[PDB]
Amino acid sequence: AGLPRRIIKETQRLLAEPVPGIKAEPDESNARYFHVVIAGPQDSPFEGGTFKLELFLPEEYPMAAPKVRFMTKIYHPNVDKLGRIKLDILADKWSPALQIRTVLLSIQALLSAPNPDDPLANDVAEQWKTNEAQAIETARAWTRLYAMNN
Amino acid sequence: AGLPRRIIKETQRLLAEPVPGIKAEPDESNARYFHVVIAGPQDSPFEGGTFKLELFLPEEYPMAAPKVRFMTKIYHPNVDKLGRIKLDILADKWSPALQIRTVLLSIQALLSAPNPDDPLANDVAEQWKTNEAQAIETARAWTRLYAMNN
Amino acid sequence: SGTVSCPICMDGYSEIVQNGRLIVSTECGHVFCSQCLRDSLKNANTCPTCRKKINRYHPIYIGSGTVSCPICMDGYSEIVQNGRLIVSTECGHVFCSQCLRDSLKNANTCPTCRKKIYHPIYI
Amino acid sequence: MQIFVKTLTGKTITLEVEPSDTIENVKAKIQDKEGIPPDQQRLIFAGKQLEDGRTLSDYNIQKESTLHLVLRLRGG
Amino acid sequence: MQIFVKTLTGKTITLEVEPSDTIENVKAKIQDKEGIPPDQQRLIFAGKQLEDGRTLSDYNIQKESTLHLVLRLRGG
Ligand SMILES: [Zn+2]
Ligand SMILES: [Zn+2]
Ligand SMILES: [Zn+2]
Ligand SMILES: [Zn+2]
Which CATH number describes the domain made up of B1-150?
3.10.110.10
CB atoms within 10 A of CB B6: 20
Q: Which residues 6+ apart lie within 8 Å of B42 measured at CB?
A: E46, E47, E48
CB atoms within 10 A of CB A84: 16
Contact A90, A83 (CB under 8 A): no
H-assigned helices in chain E: 23-34
Strand (E) or helix (H) holding C38: helix C34-43
Contact D75, A113 (CB under 8 A): yes
Classified as helix, coil or strand, A31 is strand
Of A43, A88, A97, the CB nearest to D74: A88
Contact D73, D10 (CB under 8 A): no
Q: Which residues 6+ apart lie within 8 Å of A119 measured at CB?
A: A77, A78, A86, A125, A128, D76
Domain total of chain C: 1
Q: Which ligand is nearest to the CA of C76?
A: 3
Q: Which residues 6+ apart lie within 8 Å of A14 measured at CB?
A: A24, A99, A100, A101
The alpha carbon dihedral of E45, E51, E56, E58 has a sign of: negative
Q: Which ligand is nearest to the CA of C5?
A: 1
Listing DSSP states for B5-49 in one string gives HHHHHHHHHHHHSPPTTEEEEEETTEEEEEEEEEEPPTTSTTTT-
- Give me the helix-helix angle, B5-16 and B100-112, nearest 10°: 60
Listing DSSP states for B109-126 in one string gives HHHHS--TTS-SSHHHHH
Domain range for C11:
1-123
Enter the DSSP assignment of D57: T
Single-letter amino acid, residue D65: S
Domain ranges of chain B: 1-150
Candidates A37, A134, A115; CA nearest to A76 is A115
* Sheet strand arrangement including C23-26: C31-33, C23-26, C57-59
Single-letter amino acid, residue D55: T
Give resolution in angstroms: 2.2
Q: CA E71 to CA A141: how far, in whole Å?
A: 73
Contact E5, E66 (CB under 8 A): yes
Candidates A9, A52, A21, A36; CA nearest to A148 is A52
Q: CA C77 to CA C2: how far, in whole Å?
A: 10
Q: What are phi and psi of B136, to 5 degrees?
A: -60, -45
> Contacts from E61-65 at CB under 8 Å and sequence distance 24+?
E61/E3, E61/E19, E62/E1, E63/E1, E63/E2, E63/E3, E64/E2, E64/E3, E64/E4, E65/E3, E65/E4
Q: Which residues pair with E41 in a beta bridge?
A: E71
Cis peptide before B62 (omega within 30 of 0): yes
Interface residue C3 vs chain E (CB under 8 A): no
Contact C79, C123 (CB under 8 A): no
Interface residue D4 vs chain A (CB under 8 A): no
In the PDB record, what is the listed experimental method?
A: X-ray
Q: How many residues does chain D have?
A: 76
Contact C50, C40 (CB under 8 A): no
What CATH number does residue C22 fall under? 3.30.40.10
Classified as helix, coil or strand, A102 is helix
Contact call for A115 and D71, based on CB within 8 A: no
Interface residue E8 vs chain B (CB under 8 A): yes
Listing DSSP states for C73-118 in one string gives --BHHHHHHTTPPEEE-TTS-EEEHHHHHHHHHH--B-TTT--B--
Contact A57, A32 (CB under 8 A): yes
Contact D8, A103 (CB under 8 A): no
Please state the residue numbers annotated as binding site of C: 6, 9, 28, 30, 33, 36, 47, 50, 69, 72, 91, 93, 96, 99, 110, 113
Contact A120, A84 (CB under 8 A): yes
Domain ranges of chain D: 1-76
Q: Which residues 6+ apart lie within 8 Å of A92 measured at CB?
A: none
Strand (E) or helix (H) holding B52: strand B50-56
Candidates C59, E53, B15, A45; CA nearest to D31 is C59
Q: Which residues pair with E6 in a beta bridge?
A: E12, E68
Phi-psi region of D61 (alpha: psi -120 to 50; beta: other; left: phi over 0): beta
Q: Which residues pair with E3 in a beta bridge?
A: E15
Q: CA C28 to CA E36: how far, in whole Å?
A: 9
Classified as helix, coil or strand, D44 is strand
Per-residue CA distances from D47 to A43, C53, E2 (Å): 9, 50, 54
